[PDB]
Design a protein around this ligand. Structure first.
Ligand code: AGS
Ligand code: MG
Length: 386
């Protein structure tokens, strides 16, 4: 039995999941979400507040287990500074043929790591985009083959070295166990997509708090990664501005009553407190949905630029359109009727992403969070890119 603690560090919530694996079998042992403190705009802005928020989650998880289990950690975070980088590493053995070994592959991959580091970048995910043996044949796994020459093109999802170091050092400090750091957006895609979507082409739109993350898959791997710098935080701010209420009351209103489609709504009255925390004010669910709307149309319209960019890259491989359409994830994916709005914008199939609707293995007792789009990355963290 191996145990994993997966943590997905968002700028509004930190989510955690403890899993156990035996043979082919997985079970969920604990899960929770806490308020995030000290992160903003993809950066730790208050390390002491960050540490305490993380600690608060670990304490919940341990109360659920009732046992002080050892596990290995996998921890993901979001950032607008994720980028895709391509690196080629070549080994020429001259005249003789030799067996390609785990040693040779491990060394070539170390080399690609150093080449990205020399360029001030650290990969959170690295995989091979192509193996080429003797300048003439493409293989998918070169292990035990014979070649005089091997070239490997790696695709990496990287962040700046200094971003990596800050997270690594604070986390090591807090988590007192071996850990690996990952991209929340890559792990979201791994937690929610099916294998035929990842192979034939699909776009994940992550409706997060500080910004909307965008990632596209083809041939089983990420082919493009980007963002729109407008997220649920701006929707919250719009409501707080029109109603004159606190950030917290505006988010409560959105989560409680928000709808992405307003044009058929009744004028149901809803109540909230003004900034003095005391006066009761009144609006309608329709009116709240009118605010929400404009900003969500904005986010989906700017994400459509990325969708069309991908659609061009995918059509070059002989696909018609992006066959998988759009999968919506993150907190904003829980707004009622968001898929209806996204379908009007994208003119494409749109579904909600969650671990339950991927084709990943059933996890015993995981249902409550397997069905939650904001837990996708927490699951995806325990799986790797093809
Ligand atoms: N049921 C809900 N209905 C509507 N909105 C919700 C719901 N639950 C959460 N949200 C919204 O989603 C925002 C949080 O989104 P999440 O994706 O969980 O944030 P995050 O994971 O902390 O963000 P990232 O990944 O750092 S940019 C919240 O502020 C709410 O506005
Ligand atoms: Mg997130």
């Amino acid at each position: 039995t191996v145990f994993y603690t997966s943590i997905d560090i968002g700028s509004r919530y930190i989510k955690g999941l403890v899993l156990g694996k035996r043979d082919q079998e997985w079970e969920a042992l604990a899960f929770s979400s806490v308020k995030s403190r000290g992160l903003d705009e993809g950066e730790i802005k208050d390390a002491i507040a960050f540490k305490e928020s993380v600690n608060t989650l670990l304490k919940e998880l341990e109360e659920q287990l009732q046992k002080s289990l050892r596990s290995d950690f996998v921890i993901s975070f979001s950032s607008v500074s994720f980028e895709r980088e391509d690196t080629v590493i070549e080994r020429d053995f001259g005249e003789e043929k030799r067996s390609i070994t785990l040693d040779i592959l491990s060394e070539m991959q170390s080399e690609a790591l150093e080449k990205l580091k020399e360029n001030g970048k650290t990969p959170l995910h690295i995989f091979s985009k192509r193996y080429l043996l003797d300048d003439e044949r493409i293989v998918f796994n070169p292990l035990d083959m014979k070649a005089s020459k091997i070239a490997i093109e790696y695709t990496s999802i990287v962040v700046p070295l200094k971003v990596y170091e800050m997270f690594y050092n604070f986390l090591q400090d807090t988590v007192k166990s071996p850990f690996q750091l990952k991209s929340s957006l890559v792990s979201t895609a791994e937690g929610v997509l099916t294998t035929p979507e990842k192979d034939r082409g699909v776009v994940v739109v992550n409706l997060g708090y500080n910004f909307t993350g965008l990632i596209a898959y083809k041939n089983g791997v990420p082919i493009k990664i980007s963002y729109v710098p407008v997220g649920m935080k701006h929707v919250i701010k719009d409501v707080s501005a029109v109603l004159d209420t606190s950030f917290e009351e505006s988010e409560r209103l959105i989560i409680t009553h928000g709808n992405a489609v307003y044009n058929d709504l009744k004028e149901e009255e809803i109540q909230y407190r003004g900034l003095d925390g005391n006066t009761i004010k009144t609006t309608t669910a329709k009116k709240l949905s009118v605010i929400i709307h404009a900003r969500l149309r904005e986010i989906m319209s700017k994400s459509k630029k990325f969708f069309r960019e991908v659609e061009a890259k995918i059509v070059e491989e002989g696909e018609i359109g992006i066959p998988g359409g759009v999968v919506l994830t993150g907190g904003g994916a829980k707004i009622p009727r968001i898929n209806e709005l996204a379908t009007e914008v994208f003119k494409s199939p749109v579904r909600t992403g969650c671990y339950a609707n991927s084709d990943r293995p059933s996890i015993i007792n995981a249902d409550e969070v397997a069905n939650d789009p904001s837990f996708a990355a927490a699951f995806g963290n325990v799986f790797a890119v093809s």
